[PDB]
Amino acid sequence: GDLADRFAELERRYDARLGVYVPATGTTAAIEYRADERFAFCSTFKAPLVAAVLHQNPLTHLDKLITYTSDDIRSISPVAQQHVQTGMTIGQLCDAAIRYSDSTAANLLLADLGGPGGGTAAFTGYLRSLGDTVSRLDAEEPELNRDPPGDERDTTTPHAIALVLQQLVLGNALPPDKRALLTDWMARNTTGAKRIRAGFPADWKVIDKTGTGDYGRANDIAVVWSPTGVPYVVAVMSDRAGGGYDAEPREALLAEAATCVAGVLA
Ligand SMILES: *C(=O)/C=C/N[C@@H](C(=O)O)C(C)(C)S(=O)O
């Protein structure tokens, strides 16, 4: 059989472009499909963004209260838009940015990193520090979701983002306590039930961060644990750019790609 043929069939059936990377392990081959092609990050950047903030600061920094106004609310901020009066701590922002894809939380965390482009250069530099020379973040939320196809701004590749997530969750890019916090936030994500999680059987643990955007963009980056506790990183990226800027993102495409991946990792 050829798994690449089955990913090509998903592309045909969904009128989509699919990218997949599952890093090789001591026990498994890599899975790679369009893995070095660029795809918009969309909100998947929020996971390494939280890592960047954790990396740059002592854990006491999670208790720092960030204040902001209703004018700071960006598409879409399910948690921050209910705490304009109280503010939110850096830790609460990390929680919201990963678990609810909260865009104001991510923009405040970008600002916390500092520097030109409201933290986007800093974020890109953090990925460079992890050995990623391809990915780049150029815009804040929500504009980073809306670049036209072929524009390299705000893109990564499945290969790059998978190896970033590998280093962050399974590897030693972060000290183990900071790594635990990232992992726990991804483990309690609320936005991913219909994506990678939908493709892995219920006895596999799934932690993830989604992204969605223009041109039918739908992404999910996950770490999965088998029922025997063996971890894998699964990066699935998709768009439907042939359909135009308002092409519908298709979560099912990601669930079915994940099902094909689960099939070979079983
Ligand atoms: C992270 O993936 C954020 C995505 N945001 C977009 C989405 O499709 O959910 C919008 C449409 C909220 S943003 O206005 O592009």
CA distance 3 to 31: 8
CA distance 215 to 249: 8
C-alpha torsion sign, points 35, 38, 39, 43 = positive
* Catalytic residue of the set 32, 140, 141, 256: 141
Helix (H, G, I), strand (E, B) or coil at 142: coil
Name 234's bridge partners.
222
Place of tokens 């902001």: 68
Q: Is 43 a catalytic residue?
A: yes
CA of 10 to the centre of ligand 1 (A): 23
Residues with CB under 6 A from ligand 1: 42-43, 75-76, 101, 142, 145-146, 211-213
Q: Is 141 a catalytic residue?
A: yes
64 Cβ contact list (under 8 Å, min separation 6): 89, 90
Pairing of strands 65-66, 39-40: unpaired
Tally of CB atoms within 10 A around 130: 21
As given in the structure block, the two tokens for residue 28 are 């498994």
What experimental approach yielded this model?
X-ray
CA distance 208 to 190: 9
> Within 15-74, where are the H helices?
46-56
CA distance 71 to 84: 10
CA distance 97 to 109: 9
CA of 47 to the centre of ligand 1 (A): 15
Supply φ then ψ for residue 216, to 5 degrees.
70, 25
Torsion of CA 130, 133, 138, 144, to 10 degrees: -80
Residue 210, burial from CB neighbour count under 10 angstroms (0-12, 13-18, 19+) = buried
Buried b (16+ CB within 10 A) or exposed e, 148-183: ebeeebbbbbbbbbbbbbbbbbbeebbeeebbebbb
Terminal CA-to-CA distance of the chain, rounded, Å?
16
Place of tokens 């104001």: 104
Torsion of CA 174, 177, 181, 186, to 10 degrees: 60
CA distance 79 to 83: 7
Ligand 1 pocket mutation, candidates 44, 76, 99, 194, criterion most atoms within 8 A of CB? 76
Q: Which of 109, 112, 51 is nearest to 77 (CA)?
A: 109
90, 112 contact by CB (below 8 A)? yes
235, 22 contact by CB (below 8 A)? yes
Q: Can you list the domains of the chain with their CATH numbers? A: 3-265 (3.40.710.10)
CA distance 126 to 104: 20
Helix (H, G, I), strand (E, B) or coil at 218: strand
